[PDB]
Design a protein around this ligand. Structure first.
Ligand SMILES: NC(=O)C1=CN([C@@H]2O[C@H](COP(=O)(O)OP(=O)(O)OC[C@H]3O[C@@H](n4cnc5c(N)ncnc54)[C@H](OP(=O)(O)O)[C@@H]3O)[C@@H](O)[C@H]2O)C=CC1
Ligand SMILES: NC(=O)C1=CN([C@@H]2O[C@H](COP(=O)(O)OP(=O)(O)OC[C@H]3O[C@@H](n4cnc5c(N)ncnc54)[C@H](OP(=O)(O)O)[C@@H]3O)[C@@H](O)[C@H]2O)C=CC1
Ligand SMILES: [Mg+2]
Ligand SMILES: [Mg+2]
Lengths: 434, 120, 133, 434, 120
């Protein structure tokens, strides 16, 4: 029934989990009907229904409106009761909300845009093993975005040659180096060997520079036993941070890892491999912000957030990832006011074709609480990894200094970089190739 | 092609990769803190880097904490006041490193740290 | 195309093969789209190894009958890229990054040729049809 | 039936495990019949046969030819289906192929010469805990064969006196010292005591020379519990390498040890005690190359490969142990093209009456990826162990330098050694006694 | 009978047991790398030996990695070019050890390492 499930006068409860769906009904399906279907098919005739009160377990579409997106498209708001969800289980939340409704015939397409996670539910999750503040304090780093570099080539390098690249990058000024998402354990490089050599690299660069260093050691594995075995050895090595591909590994496994990291003081870097399979298309799937909120709940200290070179949408989920209270702002993809009631924030990681000239914009857009992850941006420096890292570290600090003085990074970006090239041969050499 | 030095260029996090700051540039960074409503504070040490002596477990390092020079300058509105303390510290401990940090009662946390003086 | 488009490559019995339904952006030739799919889903330090030995490669491209601007690109991935017994790593390696490539309007993985050499590293069903019966 | 099991037109499948048997039929037994028997008796009337398809589980002789070996001798090729073997079990492979057929009355003698291990089967084995490349990187040793010495006398020495010999040998230039195969744990020297003193020796020599040192601590034991207990203490001591006699200890136990070493970063030196009981005679048994392939699969980082002072046969299984792809070459005992699909290689160990004058030939024949294990060759030096080790290290490097310059070690060997004697009193003294 | 020295003869693996190489002998080893199609690279350090500071687990050692002098000399066909870099390194870091290593893109690995210079 449209009005069993379509309740336009329903007032959401502070304990409801709310969802904003972008719905594309099939021809001949009224919006009210589509909305009701979305709610009904993602929630609740058989005699057993008489042994309880279905009304207290049904999801309900309390609002639907034509959207400006495209052809016969609408945003439907659905409210789900708190009791439907298993405490601390992102897996069950996803299963309950997006487990079945996307295949409904009456819908040509469907995409989950946002979720309002009430305090009564979020409080049942540990959340980030540490969070932005704790991480800065643990690593003793303040006043600037963090810097990192992904080791290349992806596969093919020996564990030792891999560590060599790590050391050179780190000693040059980067805070972190990182295992590619595909690097777990393979014939050309078994994981334990990589952990050993990367540990030597981490400590060599730290002793040389005097600054705390780290390398996101990928613990992503085929099984939970293997995943933990890798985290355990990193723990033995005393390194500060490990890594996991939460989507390919899965939420059940990620949550377990997040708990291990909390119990052992390990920072957890989260890569979002395979997200585009789900969040690329505007008409169907789940927008990344939903996957981002899910990660903050399941647990992660860093999370890849994409590149900056749409901006407003990125800034939108960045706030959803770092802030305690985010006000409704559909212009930035925020369909619901979100209150995290003190759950720690996650540091967003920007990566993808970024180089020294992008430093002003990146610093400007993300602010200090971010990680700027380079690739060839550092490994492609004509003088090698150490000079490349130095060029990026110098470029970044030049931007920070200028911003702190009140200069406009968005307008004076190029001059700030050009000016820094005067006293930094490394930066100058980088600005000549890019 | 130039080779990045292996010694003599130990670092102190944010801003330590820029050339030595002048008194004017230093004042600007202090003003940044004041305008941001953050509380400046000086810290000093004869050991300028992190190490691991008492433990090697994840996240544990020695040498992160330095010694506080007097107290956080609450209600400071004149950046030159910080410079004055910096000069006193340098006089009392010329063979010590001195850094300027900042605190936010809003974020309830340390959010700034940059070297201000290094011994000869 | 590129280093990545090798239309006469003979797949190895150990290669993991993928069939991608690719929808190129306007102005992106099918050959380039295919090479891109292979490159973006696989690959001074390159001098310390052999890029060819670890590159994914599009060995065949064909249009989709009845579809506008839609093609099926076949890509071959060497066995060494995958961690044994890990479906997680297989997904990460093949679909972890390529679906967001700007040169592609849309992308769908249609099938995967799992070579016996790789499947033998998985336990598989705890019991299976016959045992269950 | 000859043609149920003798299928000369059968095309081998890429998943079959192939075997090459040297068969000596009894008088009156046709070669086709002998071949069929070998296949039938090493694989597959009762009503139960009707509950399946015996054809898919039978081994088959697809080729037999008179061999040049001797009197009524033939090489029979047998193909076994992949499904007959338990994944990752060398024990089951041996049981399935050589468990019963050697006692068949119709055969006067039988010897297994080779095995074609398909990728589909080899991929189910961990293989070497580390392998050639990883070992070189871990120990930071490149460009030359490794050097070691077995401590003598075999038995009778106290644990401390044993360690004393270790230290002196190692400090002189050898990379390793080693426990005799018979040295496990006995009244005159209990294992834990030996591990303690050898550890002191390893670290004393390493600190003195600045080069990474090791001592193959024998973990071979009466039970798997004891074997692991010894590996565990070596792990506690932080030493780089342990040892096992895989044939006397057995494959089930060796595989477990190989797994422990992989999980704990320990190199595994493999001694082949008792191999001659099986691989000596050309008419019956199993050629060492089969035992070698078996070890690479079960797991080992080093494996004894014999001395060089028949050559072609040795070189044959050396390639089978180190290379990724070995082409068929019956002249070198390689009856099947073998592809290891990236399984790490094992370092071959040459030992047995070798001294300084043999360095040119050994370096020439084995190349850099080998271990040259001496005995009296170093312990018999007139000035003691340290000078003996130095003489061997100098002799080896002199050979490497000359080879690298393009000189012919096979023809200029003696001159190269004589020339090195000019600046090395230690080498000179060694060249006077041998 | 001569007693093997306990000090002053620390080693650097392959070739370190031979007398100091002359410029000609050094060139020959470099040529060996070039003819073998391997890529030469220089590494330097003020600490010339392995040690164990951060861990003592099997296979873990500190001091194995040294610092890279510039980059691997890809496409090098003139051994004297390596000598030139060796001389520059010695000038920039006379109090540092310098070794020559080689890489193979085929074996995809480091396969060479020999000392080329030791400070006074
Ligand atoms: N020397 C040369 O030949 C040159 C090399 N390059 C340079 O090399 C460097 C490579 O590193 P960089 O690109 O920074 O980062 P990486 O290649 O390490 O990629 C990091 C992230 O970028 C995104 N990404 C990159 N490729 C794609 C793709 N095919 N489709 C979708 N998303 C993609 C992904 O983001 P997410 O996980 O968020 O989806 C990925 O996680 C750059 O600086 C590049 O400009 C390019 C030109 C010249
Ligand atoms: N001072 C003196 O009185 C003299 C002492 N010696 C010398 O002492 C040294 C002893 O060490 P070394 O011989 O190098 O090595 P070991 O005695 O340590 O033996 C190592 C390997 O040699 C092989 N081996 C040795 N003896 C036999 C045998 N009886 N039958 C079969 N194989 C055998 C085995 O190889 P595998 O495991 O591969 O089967 C064994 O594993 C030599 O240099 C020898 O010349 C001899 C003459 C004089
Ligand atoms: Mg990556
Ligand atoms: Mg022995």
């Amino acid at each position: 029934y449209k009005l069993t499930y379509y309740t336009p006068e329903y007032e959401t409860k502070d304990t409801d989990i709310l969802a904003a769906f972008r719905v594309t009904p099939q021809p001949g399906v009224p919006p009210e009907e589509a909305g009701a279907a979305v709610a009904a098919e993602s929630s609740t005739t058989v005699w057993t229904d008489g042994l309880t009160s279905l009304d207290r377990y049904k999801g309900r579409c309390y609002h639907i409106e034509p959207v400006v997106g495209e052809d016969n498209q609408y945003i439907a708001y659905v409210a789900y009761p708190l009791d439907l969800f298993e405490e601390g289980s992102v897996t069950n939340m996803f299963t309950s909300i997006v487990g079945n409704v996307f295949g409904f015939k009456a819908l040509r397409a469907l995409r989950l845009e946002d979720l309002r996670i009430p305090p009564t539910y979020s409080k049942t999750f540990q959340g980030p093993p540490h969070g932005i503040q704790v991480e800065r304090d643990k690593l003793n780093k303040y006043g600037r975005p963090l810097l990192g570099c992904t080791i290349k080539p992806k596969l093919g390098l020996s564990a030792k040659n891999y560590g060599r690249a790590c050391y050179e990058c780190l000693r040059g000024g980067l805070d972190f180096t990182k295992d590619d998402e595909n690097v777990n354990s393979q014939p050309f490089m078994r994981w334990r060997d990589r952990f050993v050599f990367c540990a030597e690299a981490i400590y060599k660069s730290q002793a040389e520079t005097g600054e705390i260093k780290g390398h996101y050691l990928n613990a992503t594995a085929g099984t939970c036993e293997e995943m933990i075995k890798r985290a355990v050895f990193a723990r033995e090595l005393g390194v500060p941070i490990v890594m996991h591909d939460y989507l390919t590994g899965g939420f059940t496994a990620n949550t377990s890892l997040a708990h291990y990291c909390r119990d052992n003081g390990l920072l957890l870097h989260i890569h979002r491999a395979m997200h585009a399979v789900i969040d690329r298309q505007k008409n169907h799937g789940m927008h990344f912000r939903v996957l981002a909120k899910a990660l903050r709940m399941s647990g992660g200290d860093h999370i890849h957030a994409g590149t900056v070179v749409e901006r407003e949408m990125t800034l939108g989920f960045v706030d959803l990832l770092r802030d305690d209270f985010i006000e409704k702002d559909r212009a930035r993809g925020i369909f619901f006011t979100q209150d995290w009631v003190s759950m720690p924030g996650v540091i967003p990681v920007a990566s993808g074709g970024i180089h020294v000239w992008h430093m002003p914009a990146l610093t400007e857009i993300f602010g200090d609480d971010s990680v700027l992850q380079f690739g060839g941006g550092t490994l492609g420096h004509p003088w090698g990894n150490a000079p490349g890292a130095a060029a990026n570290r110098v470029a970044l600090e030049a931007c920070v200094q200028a911003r702190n003085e009140g200069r406009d990074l968005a307008r004076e970006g190029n001059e700030i970089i050009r000016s820094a090239c005067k006293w930094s041969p490394e930066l100058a050499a980088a600005c000549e190739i890019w | 092609m130039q080779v990045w030095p292996i010694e003599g260029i130990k670092k102190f996090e944010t801003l330590s990769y820029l050339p030595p700051l002048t008194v004017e540039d230093l004042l600007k960074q202090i003003e940044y803190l004041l305008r941001s409503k953050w509380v400046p504070c000086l810290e000093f040490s004869k050991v300028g880097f992190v190490y691991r002596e008492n433990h090697r477990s994840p996240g544990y390092y020695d040498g992160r904490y330095w010694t506080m020079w007097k107290l956080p300058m609450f209600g400071c509105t004149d950046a030159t006041q910080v410079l004055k303390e910096l000069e006193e510290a340098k006089k009392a401990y010329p063979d010590a490193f001195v850094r300027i940090i900042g605190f936010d009662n809003v974020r309830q946390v340390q959010c700034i740290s940059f070297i201000a003086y290094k011994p000869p």
